[PDB]
Amino acid sequence: KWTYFGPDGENSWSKKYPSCGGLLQSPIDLHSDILQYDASLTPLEFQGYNLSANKQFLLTNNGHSVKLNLPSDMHIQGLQSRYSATQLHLHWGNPNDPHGSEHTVSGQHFAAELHIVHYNSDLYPDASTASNKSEGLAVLAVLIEMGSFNPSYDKIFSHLQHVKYKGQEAFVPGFNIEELLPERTAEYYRYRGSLTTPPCNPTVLWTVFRNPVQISQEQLLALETALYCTHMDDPSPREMINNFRQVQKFDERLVYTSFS
Amino acid sequence: KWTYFGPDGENSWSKKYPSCGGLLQSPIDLHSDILQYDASLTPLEFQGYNLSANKQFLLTNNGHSVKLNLPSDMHIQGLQSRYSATQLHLHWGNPNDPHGSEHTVSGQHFAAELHIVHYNSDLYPDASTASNKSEGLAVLAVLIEMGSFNPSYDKIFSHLQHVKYKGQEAFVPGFNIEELLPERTAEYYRYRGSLTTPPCNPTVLWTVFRNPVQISQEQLLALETALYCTHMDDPSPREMINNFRQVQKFDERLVYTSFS
Ligand SMILES: CCCCNC(=O)c1cc(S(N)(=O)=O)c(Cl)cc1NC1CCCCC1
Ligand SMILES: CCCCNC(=O)c1cc(S(N)(=O)=O)c(Cl)cc1NC1CCCCC1
């Protein structure tokens, strides 16, 4: 059992999950001193991101986040290996402190963060097998700030009242996942890191887009208030809030940028 | 054994020091969302901070920081109990990333941080005993930024070459500790927290002064390059760099300011 609060919280994860105290942990603060321009960081191609609108995809409350299952025909091109999609999920704060992004930029939290998880389908036969192996995973990270209402994010958020409790599921019709990505996806940070949740394996190639997307105050407040980490039958509910890991030491590592 | 890097680093402190996984952990990000002005917060008075020039005070490299021993007749007035000085020490980064403060303000790391550690002498016979009782310790935190040469900090920094290795000691002649303090000390952040190092006991009343001090380019670089966490007889020396804890979660709690 692990939480983001109290005795079972992030300072104690290493007691249950060895890699959480290991090398190459994520997330990190993106700041000037550790950035290095790299011209060989070329645009990624998002292939099969336009999901079949005639297909439905499973949304689950797994007690730590809300997760959308993705099909393996969706993938990233441009990296050395092909990486096929497995799921996306989010990280957020709470109404009294709506700064719940995992990555920070010059010490500043965004409201929230989206992760699109991909596994190395050239080297490994599935995402579970890949997760603890060399070059196993690649995540796209989208930083989210309070702003304009986002119709694309609402294709997920519109279903939150039907996954309020741990283990609840809802079907989401196919839409274009590329719509969840910000402007100028050519501009990104790249570094070698880890899962930000147990088991914290140091197997992730990270791509954090430079530009945030916006969702509205009300979309943000829905995300922060809809979900519980407890089961529906539990008469002592706990709210699912502040499900973000604190930033990690970045000792020796640099962050490579496609922009300058 | 505990360090700030690799497998005995801060994510693993809780394995041997369970309070590092516990309540009221320090340091923290000082940001608007969790600040409350509190008009009842009056200026601290610094008593016997002018140390006798005829007396010598022990500087030690304890393998984690450089520590200056202070006398119990050095004290703070204006808390609920008398807090008597026991030691001061420093936290810092590295020449490639010169941002090594423990506390951050609106996500901004300072160059370095000084802590003047006091203990509740009205209730406890000594600092060691006070250190595991609530309101047992009070710490004064000074944020440090690069700027003009600081002759007062050089009263400490001129001795670093005699305490390069763990266990090494030197004597520093008494000087006015108050000279290490910033302008308008009446402006501070105040909150209940912990030791920022093992054993992480939740027993500190924190005062972080609002205004930083400056040390020069060359002073900060001397601090960052002078010392090793290893003993002189260790064949695998380790440079004492990045000896600061990451900021902690601060959920359902407030920092009080003495300023509006
Ligand atoms: C949904 C949030 C709760 C638990 N965390 C995850 O599911 C999770 C989070 C991340 S992240 N937060 O992007 O670093 C990564 Cl890379 C991978 C994860 N799972 C693996 C996905 C592939 C199969 C093995 C499980
Ligand atoms: C930095 C030096 C490495 C080892 N840690 C300490 O000496 C230390 C650091 C802090 S801190 N960084 O100010 O929170 C505090 Cl409050 C107390 C500490 N120790 C004593 C333990 C018992 C006697 C009284 C004090």
Ligand SMILES: [Zn+2]
């Ligand atoms: Zn994630």
Ligand SMILES: [Zn+2]
């Ligand atoms: Zn300290």
